[PDB]
Amino acid sequence: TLVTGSEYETMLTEIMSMGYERERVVAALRASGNNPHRAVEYLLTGIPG
């Protein structure tokens, strides 16, 4: 499954409704390969490492 550009932006907007800045959410989505479960996990408790 590949999300579209529009779906990526709406995902980013939704995660930003928790208060995170755009660049941080972009970085988390990159680290998680656009899996929102892992992206939010990484915003909450850290990226792998």
UniProtKB/Swiss-Prot annotation:
What subcellular locations does the record give?
Nucleus
All copies of domain UBA, residue ranges: 6-46
Binding partners and assembly: Interacts with XPC; the interaction is suggesting the existence of a functional equivalent variant XPC complex. Interacts with PSMD4 and PSMC5. Interacts with ATXN3. Interacts with UBQLN2.
Q: According to its record, what is known about the domains?
A: The ubiquitin-like domain mediates interaction with ATXN3. The ubiquitin-like (UBL) and the UBA (ubiquitin-associated) domains interact intramolecularly in a highly dynamic manner, as each UBA domain competes for an overlapping UBL domain surface. Binding of ubiquitin or proteasome subunit PSMD4 disrupt the UBL-UBA domain interactions and drive RAD23A in to an open conformation.
In the record, the note on similarity to other proteins reads: Belongs to the RAD23 family.
Free-text function comment from the UniProt entry: Multiubiquitin chain receptor involved in modulation of proteasomal degradation. Binds to 'Lys-48'-linked polyubiquitin chains in a length-dependent manner and with a lower affinity to 'Lys-63'-linked polyubiquitin chains. Proposed to be capable to bind simultaneously to the 26S proteasome and to polyubiquitinated substrates and to deliver ubiquitinated proteins to the proteasome. Involved in nucleotide excision repair and is thought to be functional equivalent for RAD23B in global genome nucleotide excision repair (GG-NER) by association with XPC. In vitro, the XPC:RAD23A dimer has NER activity. Can stabilize XPC.
Q: What is this protein called?
A: UV excision repair protein RAD23 homolog A
